[PDB]
Scaffold this active site. Structure first.
Site, PDB file in Angstrom:
ATOM      1  N   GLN A  66       0.787  -1.228   0.000  1.00 30.95           N
ATOM      2  CA  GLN A  66       0.000   0.000   0.000  1.00 30.95           C
ATOM      3  C   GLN A  66       0.823   1.284   0.000  1.00 30.95           C
ATOM      4  O   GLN A  66       0.269   2.375  -0.129  1.00 30.95           O
ATOM      5  CB  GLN A  66      -0.967   0.002   1.184  1.00 30.95           C
ATOM      6  CG  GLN A  66      -2.209  -0.824   0.938  1.00 30.95           C
ATOM      7  CD  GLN A  66      -3.108  -0.891   2.148  1.00 30.95           C
ATOM      8  OE1 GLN A  66      -2.744  -1.491   3.163  1.00 30.95           O
ATOM      9  NE2 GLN A  66      -4.289  -0.271   2.057  1.00 30.95           N
ATOM     10  N   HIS A 124      -3.383  -8.527   1.845  1.00 28.51           N
ATOM     11  CA  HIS A 124      -2.643  -7.564   1.045  1.00 28.51           C
ATOM     12  C   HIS A 124      -1.292  -8.180   0.703  1.00 28.51           C
ATOM     13  O   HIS A 124      -0.787  -8.027  -0.410  1.00 28.51           O
ATOM     14  CB  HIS A 124      -2.409  -6.261   1.823  1.00 28.51           C
ATOM     15  CG  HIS A 124      -3.536  -5.284   1.729  1.00 28.51           C
ATOM     16  ND1 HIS A 124      -4.033  -4.835   0.525  1.00 28.51           N
ATOM     17  CD2 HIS A 124      -4.248  -4.648   2.690  1.00 28.51           C
ATOM     18  CE1 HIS A 124      -5.001  -3.965   0.747  1.00 28.51           C
ATOM     19  NE2 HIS A 124      -5.152  -3.834   2.052  1.00 28.51           N
TER      20      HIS A 124
HETATM   21 ZN   LIG Z   1      -6.396  -2.671   2.990  1.00 34.04          ZN
END
Ligand SMILES: [Zn+2]
Ligand SMILES: [Zn+2]
Ligand SMILES: [Zn+2]
Ligand SMILES: [Zn+2]
Length: 184
Positions: free
Chosen positions: A55, A144
Site C-alpha cells: 500500500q 494484502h
Molecule cells: Zn487494505
C-alpha cells in the site's frame, strides 16, 4: 532491502502494485526500522488502522496496525513475514474499510481469530494469538501480502453493492495515469 522516500504515499486500487506479489524480508536493518515508523505515520495521518507495505509502493512482506488509530493511544503491532498457523472455525461479519479504496465500506466474513508466527524488525521470531478487532485487521492486511484485496472475499451480493464504486476508481486511475487499468 527496501528503498523508500519519506512521506510515504498511499497506493490506491486498481494500481498493479496491490497484486504484484510480495518478497519476504531477509534484511533486518535501520532502513527496515525507518520504514515501519514511516508506515505508522501515513497510517495515522490518513486516520487508518492498518497498513501493508504494498500500500506504500513496496512489494515486501511487512505489515503494521493499531486498533486505536491514534499515535500513543493504542497498541502498535508490526509483523514481518507473518504466517497464519491456525485460524478460527467460527465466522463473523464486519464492515471493512481500506486505505486503497477511499471511503468505501462493505461487509466481509472472516474467521474470528487467528494464531500467527512472524519476525520483528531485528529478525527475531515471535508468536501471538489475535481475536476481536486485531484479528480482523490482521487478516485484511495479511491478504494484502498475498496480493489479495478485500472485495475478493466479499459475497457476490455485497460485491454488487460497490461495483460502481470500484468502477469509479478504475476510471480515475485511467484518467490520472493515462494507462488502462487491470479492472473488472
Ligand atoms: Zn487494505
Ligand atoms: Zn532480501
Ligand atoms: Zn516518522
Ligand atoms: Zn457500472
Amino acid at each position: 532491502d527496501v528503498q523508500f522516500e519519506t512521506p510515504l504515499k498511499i497506493v490506491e486500487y486498481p494500481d498493479p502494485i496491490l497484486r504484484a506479489k510480495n518478497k519476504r524480508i531477509d534484511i533486518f536493518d535501520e532502513n527496515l526500522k525507518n520504514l515501519v515508523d514511516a508506515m505508522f505515520d501515513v497510517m495515522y495521518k490518513t486516520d487508518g488502522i492498518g497498513l501493508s507495505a504494498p500500500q506504500v509502493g513496496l512489494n515486501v512482506q511487512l505489515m503494521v496496525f493499531n486498533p486505536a488509530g491514534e499515535p500513543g493511544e493504542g497498541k502498535e503491532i508490526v509483523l514481518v513475514n507473518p504466517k497464519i498457523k491456525k485460524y478460527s472455525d467460527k465466522l463473523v461479519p464486519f464492515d471493512e474499510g481500506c486505505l486503497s479504496f477511499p471511503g468505501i465500506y462493505a461487509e466481509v466474513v472472516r474467521p474470528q481469530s487467528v494464531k500467527i508466527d512472524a519476525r520483528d524488525i531485528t529478525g527475531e521470531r515471535f508468536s501471538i494469538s489475535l481475536s476481536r478487532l486485531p484479528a480482523r485487521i490482521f487478516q485484511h492486511e495479511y491478504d494484502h501480502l498475498e496480493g489479495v484485496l478485500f472485495f475478493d472475499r466479499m459475497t457476490d451480493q455485497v460485491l454488487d453493492s460497490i461495483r460502481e464504486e470500484l468502477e469509479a476508481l478504475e476510471k480515475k486511475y485511467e484518467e490520472k495515469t493515462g494507462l488502462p487499468s487491470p479492472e473488472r
